[PDB]
Structures are given as structure tokens and as C-alpha cells.
Symmetry: D2
Subunit: 114 residues, 4 copies
């Protein structure tokens, strides 16, 4: 199944935050309406926050997370959870290797803000 | 129901990251085995990361998040999600006022690391 | 925080299914747009499926679950999860006693159907 | 990533319940410690319950859901959600065709029971 794609409400601010847990340098690209809107890179085995930014979901509300290591796409896992019918989290994990820890880049999207 | 309490595997590193979305300064306490292990304080209406840390779940695995604003406890909402039976997210929202956005402090716990 | 309230897409068929795990007789009310649309009842400590129904979310999309036992309202916990940005589950647990298992009536809402 | 595999607490009763939403007859196999423990088959386009059963997670706690239609494996999506650190849902959707609704068989695993 497709993973790392989320439909947000249109024209809505959201937070995106990426963490790294791998010997491989992570590249996190965050696409809004199929164009890169934020990019984070880094290498950590201790959950560094390799980036955090506020973006706008724009007219389509389509948000996609892509994770690659030196140009090789990582395998993604994802889901969205809603608390008290108001508070939204879009969650991504990624695997750059063979151990299937799926934490090599971890991306958290949250909305609403403010 | 109790919210903001999570059972992690024992003796396991985890990440905790807090975001703020309120006119009020948020104070987040992260407890391990009922004792505060991290405190983050900050003020943002734009989802700023007010703190991030790596902690160890220790012998009990018990992790609790508490949020206060102007010396008063916020109401919490929480859940845990597991992706591909490997990647864990413990999610907390908090409400310090009357609008029930539950984003006033947002806390994300993730494990495993490395 | 409020629990057991979900916003579905308007005019959308959904499934609602109730499970019982308590010595107390469960009564589960399912409200659509603040009017009772389904009532299920039973008594099981082995997860009996006391009801399952297909309902339509109608113009408002508002669905609320309430649970009572021997005339007393149960405490609710809830969340919504979305898989592959398409498959939706709205989840409720309820507690009628002292043990905080929150399984006394369990309600799962799923959409889309067909 | 692997989907439909869940680690339950050992020696714990759990519920498994399947729904169908497809022109294809669904076959749901539930494996405990890699051995078939339950099988449900049925056909519905209206979310009918095609099976429900109570199983024991046994010494390993390993539970796996597989779905096939006319002997062809469906693609799966899954996650686990925990409410109030007590109430567990292991959720599976499956796709037997081209529309990516992932509801063709829906499988809900819930624990604890009782
Ligand atoms: C420390 C481990 O790092 C692994 N990752 C790698 O070993 C890795 C992956 C891709 C590329 C590279 C690499 C390539 C060129 C130079 C340096 C590192 C390493 C990762 O999958 C494991 O879960 C674990 O966190
Ligand atoms: C900007 C708004 O800020 C609210 N914040 C408050 O209601 C709040 C609650 C307690 C104290 C304060 C505060 C503290 C010092 C100075 C000014 C305000 C704000 C918050 O709940 C809303 O969701 C929104 O983000
Ligand atoms: C078997 C247990 O049942 C409990 N519930 C009760 O014991 C209960 C709740 C409400 C009413 C009654 C009841 C009252 C009068 C006479 C008989 C039963 C029991 C429940 O909370 C526990 O999790 C557990 O499943
Ligand atoms: C009604 C539709 O049914 C589709 N499924 C099929 O049409 C399907 C898939 C596999 C096999 C068969 C089939 C094959 C032989 C005989 C009868 C059914 C149908 C399903 O994917 C769609 O979401 C939708 O619910
Ligand atoms: Ca890895
Ligand atoms: Ca890793
Ligand atoms: Ca608020
Ligand atoms: Ca706020
Ligand atoms: Ca109970
Ligand atoms: Ca019970
Ligand atoms: Ca389908
Ligand atoms: Ca279908």
C-alpha cells in the first residue's frame, strides 16, 4: 500500500519534524502539492531532530514525505491518528537497510497549530 | 480515563520532543518511574520545539507526561500507535484554556532509537 | 477531553460494531447528528459481538457513542486511526467499574464500506 | 514493510473479527506462533461479519493475519493503537483489486478481554 501520503485540510498550517537513527545520512523531503517545501539532512544514531518547520498544506491539502539515503528511497510506513476529534498526527517511519527497525528517519506531522 | 501515561519496554532509550502552540508559556515534565527526568519550558504560537531529549525508560518502563501553564495542570489527551510491529509513537496533546484545540503543548515520544 | 465523538465525511455509509467484556449488562447508543441511530445491548466476558450495523453519517457526519451499564454512564476513551490515507477506524473503549481495563464495551466504527 | 503481524502479550486471550466489503469471497487466516488458529470465509459488499472468535496468543504472543481471495494473497495495511495505556486494537485492511479502498476484508483484533 502507498505510505507517507496524507490529505490535510486545505490551506492549513502544520508542523513537520524529522528524527534520525542510522549510520546512513538521511534526506527527508516534504512535498506540498507535489513540490518540495522543506528538506532536512543529517546523520544521527541518537534521535537528533534533523529538522522542524511550519508549512502550509495549500489548495490540495496533499502532503507527502519522502526519505532517501544518498538518492536511494527508504521503505516507508505511516498512519494518521486523531485525538479528541481535533488533534491530528501523521506519522512516518523509514528503513534504509536490512534490520527493519523503521526508525532510520522518523517524521511527525502535527496540526492544527496556533 | 488517565492520559499521558505509557508503558515502554524496560531499559530502552526513547526520544521525547515538545512543541508549543499557546499564548501561555508551557512547562512539560517527563517522568520516568513517577520521577521527573526532563523539563521543557517555552512559549510559541507557531509550533516551536520547546525541548527534545533522549531518556531511558529504566526498570519500570513507566513514562508520564505532565503539562502546566501559569502553575496549573493542563488537561491531556493521548494514545500510542505502533507501525509494522516495530516503530512506536506515544502522543500527547494538552489544553490550557477554552478552545479545546489540545495543541497548547504537544509531546511526541518515539522508540526505539539507534 | 471529550471522547466517543467523531466527524465522518457527510452522507457516508459506515459500520459500527460493539463487543462486551464485563459482568455488567452493556447498553451502547450510537447517535448520528445527535439522534439515536442504533442501540445494542448484551452481557459477555468473552467479547460477544452484541451488535453490528451499517449506518449513514448523514448531512453533519457527526457520530457519537455512549455506553451505560445498569443505568449508569461508562467513562469513555477513543481515537481515530487512518491507514494508507483511506481506511478509517474510530475506536471506543468504556469502563463501568474499578479495574480500568476500558474493554467493558468496545466499539469500532469503520469506513468506507463496499 | 511487513503488515498484519502483531506482538501480543504472551498467554493472553484476544478477539478477532472480520468484515467483508468486496465482490470477492474473502478468506482470512489467523496464525498464532506461525500456525493457523482460526479461519473465516465469506462474501459481502455491506461490511457483514464473516467471522469472530476468541483465541489465545500463547507463549510467543505472535499473531499474524493473512487475507486471500480465490487463493491470491491480498495486499495488507495494519497498525496497533493503545488507548489509556490499557486497551489494544490491532487493525488490518486488505486490497484484492485495483481501487485501493483496503476494506475488502477488514480484521479487528482486540485485547484484553474479560
Ligand atoms: C546504525 C544502524 O545504521 C543502519 N544504516 C546503515 O548502516 C546505513 C544505511 C545506508 C547507508 C549507510 C552509509 C552509506 C555511506 C556512508 C556511510 C553510511 C549506512 C540502520 O539501518 C540501522 O537501523 C542502524 O540504525
Ligand atoms: C493563542 C491561544 O492561546 C491560548 N492560551 C490560553 O488560553 C492560556 C491559558 C493559560 C494562560 C495563558 C497565558 C499566560 C501568560 C500570558 C498570557 C496568557 C494562556 C490557547 O489555549 C489557544 O489554543 C490559543 O493557542
Ligand atoms: C468481570 C469484570 O466485570 C466488571 N464489571 C462489573 O463487575 C459490573 C459493572 C456494572 C454492573 C455490575 C453488576 C451490578 C449488579 C449485579 C450484577 C452485576 C457489574 C468490569 O469492569 C471488569 O473489567 C471485568 O470485566
Ligand atoms: C465491489 C468491489 O469488489 C472489488 N473486488 C473485486 O471485484 C474482486 C477481487 C478479486 C476477485 C474477485 C472475483 C473473482 C472471481 C469471482 C468473483 C469475484 C472480485 C473490491 O476490490 C472493490 O473495493 C469493491 O469492493
Ligand atoms: Ca534500519
Ligand atoms: Ca535505525
Ligand atoms: Ca487551547
Ligand atoms: Ca493552541
Ligand atoms: Ca472494566
Ligand atoms: Ca472488562
Ligand atoms: Ca478494494
Ligand atoms: Ca472494497
Amino acid at each position: 500500500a502507498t505510505q507517507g501520503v496524507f490529505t490535510l485540510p486545505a490551506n492549513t498550517r502544520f508542523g513537520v519534524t524529522a528524527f534520525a537513527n542510522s549510520s546512513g545520512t538521511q534526506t527527508v523531503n516534504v512535498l506540498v502539492n507535489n513540490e518540495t517545501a522543506a528538506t532536512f539532512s543529517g546523520q544521527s544514531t541518537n534521535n537528533a531532530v534533523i529538522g522542524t518547520q511550519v508549512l502550509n498544506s495549500g489548495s490540495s491539502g496533499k502532503v507527502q514525505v519522502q526519505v532517501s539515503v544518498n538518492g536511494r528511497p527508504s521503505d516507508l510506513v505511516s498512519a494518521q491518528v486523531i485525538l479528541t476529534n481535533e488533534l491530528n498526527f501523521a506519522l512516518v517511519g523509514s528503513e534504509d537497510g536490512t534490520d527493519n527497525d523503521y526508525n532510520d528517519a522518523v517524521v511527525v506531522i502535527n496540526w492544527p497549530l496556533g
